[PDB]
Structures are given as structure tokens and as C-alpha cells.
Design a binder for this molecule. Structure first.
Ligand SMILES: [Zn+2]
Ligand SMILES: [Zn+2]
Ligand SMILES: [Zn+2]
Ligand SMILES: [Zn+2]
Lengths: 50, 50
């Protein structure tokens, strides 16, 4: 994965843990290649396989 | 048009005046129906026709 920080325009959940990516901006990280969305706290817990 | 404020993820120009929508977040307004992108200062100068 190549996670880049993303500003989400709709309530989006974290593809790793299932809770909402809270906030107005900078809510999480979106992988540039496959679109997985994760909380900053969950990026490290995701397998690299993309 | 139904302009809603948008957080752009790439350098985007204003479809009304041609200058860059400056900033990291809240750079401009995107029309929800046809995707036109405008600076907050240009929203009022755009014809309504969407
Ligand atoms: Zn990925
Ligand atoms: Zn999470
Ligand atoms: Zn429009
Ligand atoms: Zn403009």
C-alpha cells in the first residue's frame, strides 16, 4: 500500500477496523493504488499486500 | 448550480476565472450536479445555468 492522507467528502469507514473516519478533513489515509481507507492509528496494523 | 464547499486533492483551477484554487482544504466550491469548480469569490459571478 501507498497511503496518502485524504480529505473525505462523505462519512467513510475505516476498511481495517470498521469505525468512522472522524473529522472534517484529514480524516484518514487512502491507499493511492487500491483505495483502501484507514485511520492514522490503523495504518500500521494493515498487511502490506495491495 | 448547487455549490458545496470541497476539499481538493490535486491542484485544481477555477472553472470561472482560470486561477488556481489555493489552499490545502476548503479551496473552493464544487457544484454537486455538474462538477463546476469555483473560488468562493467567483461563485457569485457564475451564471446559474447548470
Ligand atoms: Zn493498497
Ligand atoms: Zn481504523
Ligand atoms: Zn452546476
Ligand atoms: Zn475564480
Amino acid at each position: 500500500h501507498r497511503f496518502k492522507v485524504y480529505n473525505y467528502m462523505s462519512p467513510t469507514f475505516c476498511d481495517h477496523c470498521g469505525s468512522l473516519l472522524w473529522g472534517l478533513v484529514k480524516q484518514g489515509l487512502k491507499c493511492e493504488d487500491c483505495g483502501m481507507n484507514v485511520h492514522h492509528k490503523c495504518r500500521e496494523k494493515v498487511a502490506n499486500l495491495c
